[PDB]
Symmetry: C5
């Protein structure tokens, strides 16, 4: 079959609608999310019009093979969506009402810089390539754009499911293409992060600061180096909870700073020992006494600078 | 083919039944479980009515392509189920008895707050979208709802397989949808958790408490800090056994508390040393002597409080 | 097509045979294994009988679509098997010789209680659902049940591939079902376990026992606690080699006991130190001297008890 | 259908063009990447020529089955691409404008020697096997070779998507094969590697150098050995970040050198102690004093040498 | 279609060839390797013979559906190969020249005993099952057996791609089967193994040996135990590089021996301390002095013995 012919020289409008049934498998590393939804399509084909009085039925139901259907594809999918045509409905004027249920793995880039206080906009881009006989343009029927109340993505608050009504019409491979941006807005449930990541990580670092109320070089070497091991071990433990970003994140910056602090605490411990050994105990004692306040203060400050620097 | 026509204006009743053959791959992280079951369907399609005497046969057998079959889908599946029609049997009144064997990856949210003493209700939601000519309504034939005795989910006790008889009939995208809730009830086999997770984790903590019968600051630093490392390594070891919950679980609150205890034990060890060093050995000794009882008591109390809050 | 009609009132006998070509992907955690095998089927359909003289042929070859074929399925598969009909052959009496090559992922429960001295019986359950016109019964042709010599499952000795001749005939959803139990017997190759798991684990534990020839509390704390870390580190290293059982295994009991031993060794080390410190060195010395024999003896006794309980 | 016949003795030219829609799953270990793109094909088939006046059409649209289409394959794919013919258009002269959307997993060797300062050229090799009647030759239409602006590969800067215009025409299995090299140029985003990999790794090594301002053999053994553990623990933490190269990398050579440094630091610590114990404290002190400069200077010198060898 | 009829009573010869296009995904654990190649087939079908003169063609080209093609399968594949018929060409005598491009996941057992100095022979077994009318026998056309020069398997040197010309003709499921052994010979690239695995592992063990130049029991306990932890940590670190063998490998024998050495070093350290403490310092000193030579010598000797036993 060929596309419906234009009355004048106008493009064909395909009214689209996505209704989210299920959201699952948000892969932080792959930057992909699996989605199960309805895709509704509507357009006028006058070749399929009929006088309801002459005809035999109000609405004529067709098989996909029987009539012309626009080839709608998704831009940001790994492979083509798995679709199952639920219904095709032709009214007396030739207004086609298409409906399919599809599942797809959608590639949408993620920004982990504010982890775990991040929010994401997941995109589903609808596209239609224009044909030889006439141009095809996508449109949004907002009555057919929604999401099931039960839609969930463990660890996230599902904010909204909307579409940018104005399509992106552009040329590609010598033909017009009309694109639609459907947006799923999600924000992370950051609470567990405090008792799970930050708090135990801070306790380890705080244990290293006890070296400031000790003069035993052996006990101090043990405190600093053994906590450093505990820190790395704890990091190994929480690897999984942190996302795949091969770029600097807020949490990643706190963590880097904590590594610097272990190194500085070693310097202090080393300095204090050398001074004592090299018969300068008054300096050694004044440095250790200062560090007791200097360490928490410089830490707490650098964290406000970090927080501010990120938010 | 079109749906069977109504005699008056009545909806079509599709009598459903699911019989569980196999239950497998319960993914605590994905919140998905895989299923292999029979799906039985029964409706009346008078266009198929026959005379047993002319036909010879008491029951007619058809291929799925030959007759109209209702489009039943599952709401909470990853992709459409893999189905194989086992049998289609038409009696002369036009009553169709459909049967298929299907496998599906079902998405059902899980609540790990009580892990490992958690129980779950797994849902399989059956759905049918009504058509232009007539409304379709789902029903439950309880004689056809069951599960194979051999059905297992390693680590769980399979309690029951039932269906909420009353369907959820509602409107969606300008058409009626009739939904059925099939429930698989499971409860976790928590025993192994004691010798596997808790007991070795408690022994490590108890070793740290021996610092309360020691005055050697070096030996105490080694006890606390090395046990803390042992705890983190033990935690990495049991990572897998613990579920994916990005929220606070019961097992999780105990693990957080154990981290707090290591920090408090460090404070004590540090305090006791400073007092001794700052010529106050009587206080140092009274604090250590108190700690011996304080630590187990406060621990035992806080664990009772936790259990109470979670259960 | 309909099933062949009964001469009297007899059920139809389908003679089955499975010949294992390949066995791969034994997943200890999923309790699943993948299989590539031939499935042979045999029955008599007198409607297919021919006079070889008129036909000029001794044997007629058919396409699966052309004739009636019994619907054989497997009970314990994740999804339906991938099959390719190799041959369909008909002899003048109406005897059908069916053959297909199939691959399938089979779910079979495993018992890890005796690991690594465990043996497993893998099950492949063949099934046929009876029809309205006649009952269908499965049978085993043992000449037709075999396995390729090259069939392997790394880490296991493939003992036998057989079938329990007597089918399990039972009623399900108001129809007869004839089931066949095909068994693949495997026994674990436990040798590598000694140099890979037990021996290094025992050496670490034996190092902690040297604390019984030392009076240095600091050296003893280091011996017991550092070996405990080494043990946990070693467990982590061997995680993979140990299976997924969420229940107590033989190796699992030994490992738990080894954790108890580290705790007891700490108690001793702590006790010996307190007694010394609290001016009772004779008791401290007698406890340490006893421990030297008590520890290996109680260990060796407890292991004999465990072995006995498990075997 | 047979290929279009030659007017003289000329080969058939198939003008190709790949337009990258999506790029995902760059697997550093597998040396594979996934791609979603348009494949455009152009050729003149005079048998398809038509008079637009008689036909009433300016352009004829065909189904792939209806006309002859060249069999284009990709050399370096895991399995054959998943393709969906978007459009086939014929103009009155017999020009065929083919277009398909395809997804494919591409195998392209990677060179990790300069990690994380490495750049890669990804290859997608297009191929056509010539037929009995005429030779088929591939060509590149550069206007039709592009990539979507949104194309990303997390951790990489996507430099260019081009094709080596000159095809590689060669004989294989007694027939001509015309090959096209499509190149996707990528360069690694190395910044995060400094705060993530190198800096914490260098701090650990620097802590070991403090043993050169200490005479306590016990404190020194703790410094060197505990940092060695921390280093190994740190590598385990960053295993994932480093690529799969089973050959020597730049990062890899630095890491090996750091292991040598821990060994040398042990020798020093051991030597200094033996001399001190064997009543030669002046030598012990001069060795330690030298080490303070020798260690950083030699490390710095060797890194300069390494950088030079790799760049 | 039926197979070509025999002139006398002779079997049909199918001349085979495999030309390796791609070699990828060699999975050491699964013992599977992925292949992408051409499969060439040639056989005589006199029903297809023609006179070039009254036909006008030198060669006739057919569609797979038009003529009879032998059903060639692979024995050791997980699922059936993905094939795409490239060309079918009949010469005047009736000789068919078939060609397809296929990809397949081949199961071939691997022997890791000599790792990393191990070589492997990967098998691709071609098979044809004989038919009712005539027997089918496989043959090797060596002109059509090859591999692309660019064929690679990261970490291996691709030695050769050959076929054992003489087929293995045998009976299976009451019918003749003709098998062909195609061999891909690979040998491992063992270089980084030295700087990556062995060298850092030997440095850790050498650090432990420093305890033979020390009399401090505390320093010695720290040296032996902390290096033991570092060793285990290093193992956890190199797990990935070592293959899946659940049997004793060459590298694995060295590793086991290294565990024994840590245990022996502990015994020495313990013995030396007891003797000193029990007023026998001359024996303690002579044992430690001996150990200094005994340890490296016994190590170097048993390594020579092991190498000899494995090679
Ligand atoms: Cl799509
Ligand atoms: Cl479904
Ligand atoms: Cl099956
Ligand atoms: Cl391809
Ligand atoms: Cl195959």
């Amino acid at each position: 079959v060929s596309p419906p012919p234009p009355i004048a020289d106008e493009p064909l409008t395909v009214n689209t609608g996505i209704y989210l049934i299920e959201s699952y498998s948000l892969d932080d590393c792959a930057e992909t999310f699996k989605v199960n939804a309805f895709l509704s399509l509507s357009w006028k084909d006058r070749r399929l019009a009929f006088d309801p009085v002459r005809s035999g039925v109000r609405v004529k139901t067709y098989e996909p093979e029987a009539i012309w259907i626009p080839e709608i594809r998704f831009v940001n999918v790994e492979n083509a969506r798995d679709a199952d045509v639920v219904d095709i409905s032709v009214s007396p004027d030739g207004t086609v009402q298409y409906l399919e249920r599809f599942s797809a793995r959608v590639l949408s880039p993620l920004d982990f810089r504010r982890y775990p206080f991040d929010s994401q906009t997941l995109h589903i881009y609808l596209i239609v390539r224009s044909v030889d006989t006439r141009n095809i343009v996508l449109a949004v029927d907002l009555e057919k754009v929604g999401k099931n109340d039960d839609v969930f993505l463990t660890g996230w608050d599902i904010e909204s499911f909307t579409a940018v009504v104005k399509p992106a019409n552009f040329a590609l491979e010598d033909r017009l293409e009309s694109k639609l941006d459907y947006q799923l807005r999600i924000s992370r449930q950051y609470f567990s992060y405090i008792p799970n990541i930050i708090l135990p990580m801070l306790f380890i670092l705080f244990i290293s600061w006890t070296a400031f109320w000790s003069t035993s070089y052996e006990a101090n070497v043990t405190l600093v180096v053994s906590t450093l091991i505990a820190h790395i071990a704890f990091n190994i433990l929480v690897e999984t909870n942190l996302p795949c970003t091969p770029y600097m994140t807020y949490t990643g910056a706190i963590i880097f700073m904590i590594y610097l602090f272990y190194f500085v605490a070693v310097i202090e411990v080393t300095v204090q020992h050398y001074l004592k050994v090299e018969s300068q105990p008054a300096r050694a004692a004044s440095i250790t006494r200062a560090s007791r306040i200097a360490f928490p203060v410089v830490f707490l400050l650098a964290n406000i600078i970090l927080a501010f620097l990120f938010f």
